[PDB]
Design a protein around this nucleic acid. Structure first.
Ligand SMILES: *CC[C@H](OP(*)(=O)O)[C@H](O)COP(=O)(O)O
Ligand SMILES: [Mg+2]
Ligand SMILES: [Mg+2]
Ligand SMILES: [Mg+2]
Length: 326
DNA sequence: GTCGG
DNA sequence: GCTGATGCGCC
DNA sequence: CGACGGCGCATCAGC
């Protein structure tokens, strides 16, 4: 838990700026600072010491001085006592209630868990499922359950078409001991950057996972991205496993490396790496790495035959998945 | 909130 | 219907 | 002082 006090302070400040202030760049600034301090292999003894790290400026240095002197932050003390703030911070924990919906709900007097359950007809489909599994979704998944979930998905995908490849990404591919959810990258040879030679490629997989009662609910679904809910089967007379979030992303098979880089994360690593790419005159998305032309208009996709090729282009030494976490 | 022209 | 803007989601 | 990562799906306004 080294500099755990400081990183917890910065995360709380980030969530405030995101949820209450709707200040996305302040949110990103706080999380970048939190991530760089988490990686620092010494007990920070001063704001001046922290300020030497990239992402920590004058204002974060001053808060760290306050926090090390007093073990708290008066700004955070006040946010915690503010009723609108604490109402908004609570509601934003429901899947599908963002900053705008939370403030809207608070404006209608809907501020608590009881208030939401009374007001189900005021909730869209996503929000109703977020409410139904509120408690379940705050639970982390042990790596042991992630391996059982992997076995069901990979085995069920093989049953639809042996040409599908399914890869579990997110914190699981980074080798975390627990995961917030299950992120699945899907490829099929019939879907490339050049041609969709078969329709319902994602649909057929979702349908098989519904048929064996693994996928239990849908939050959203298009041609390339599924967002839903799944659950491990339980034994005779055992308590049921919690319901879990599942994301499935179908990526063009020739663009697998850009796709697996994106879907492995972490989010903060992606933002740091894409920001660095821009500094080096390249743009990275889940599909391609492209050069920026004279104008600032992206050029043709560069050849990529490995994750490492993307690192090479922007002149970074390769980071294994396990080294891309916070 | 921070960084780099 | 379509297109473009916005909210909320993913890493 | 401008830029800050990039894009999928749901929803709604305007034509
Ligand atoms: C943490 C201190 C703040 O840094 P940012 O530009 O959010 C400001 O210095 C104080 O502003 P406040 O939020 O009005 O206290
Ligand atoms: Mg995840
Ligand atoms: Mg996910
Ligand atoms: Mg995540």
């Amino acid at each position: 838990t080294l500099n755990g006090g400081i990183t917890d302070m910065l995360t709380e400040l980030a969530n405030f700026e995101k949820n209450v202030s709707q200040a996305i760049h302040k949110y990103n600034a706080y999380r970048k600072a939190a991530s760089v301090i988490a990686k620092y292999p010494h007990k920070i003894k001063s704001g001046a010491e922290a300020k030497k790290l990239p992402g920590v400026g004058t204002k974060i240095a001053e808060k760290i001085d306050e926090f090390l002197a007093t073990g708290k932050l008066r700004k955070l003390e006040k946010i915690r006592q503010d009723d609108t703030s604490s109402s908004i911070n609570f509601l934003t924990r429901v899947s599908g209630i963002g900053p705008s919906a939370a403030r809207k709900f608070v404006d209608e007097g809907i501020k608590t868990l009881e208030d939401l359950r009374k007001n189900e007809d005021k909730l869209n489909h996503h929000q109703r499922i977020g409410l139904k599994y509120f408690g379940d979704f705050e639970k982390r998944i042990p790596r042991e359950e992630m391996l059982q979930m992997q076995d069901i998905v990979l085995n069920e995908v093989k049953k639809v078409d042996s040409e599908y490849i399914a890869t579990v990404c997110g914190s699981f591919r980074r080798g975390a001991e627990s995961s917030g959810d299950m992120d699945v990258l899907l490829t099929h040879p019939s879907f490339t950057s050049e041609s969709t030679k078969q329709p319902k490629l994602l649909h057929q997989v979702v349908e098989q996972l519904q048929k064996v009662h693994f996928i239990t609910d849908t939050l959203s679904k298009g041609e390339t991205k599924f967002m839903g809910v799944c659950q491990l089967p339980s034994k005779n007379d055992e308590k049921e496993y919690p319901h879990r979030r599942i994301d499935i992303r179908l990526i063009p098979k020739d663009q697998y490396y850009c796709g697996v880089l994106y879907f492995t994360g972490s989010d903060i690593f992606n933002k740091n790496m894409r920001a660095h790419a821009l500094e080096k005159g390249f743009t990275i998305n889940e599909y391609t790495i492209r050069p920026l032309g004279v104008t600032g208009v992206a050029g043709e996709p560069l050849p990529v035959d490995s994750e490492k090729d993307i690192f090479d282009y922007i002149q970074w030494k390769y980071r294994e998945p396990k080294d891309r976490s916070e």
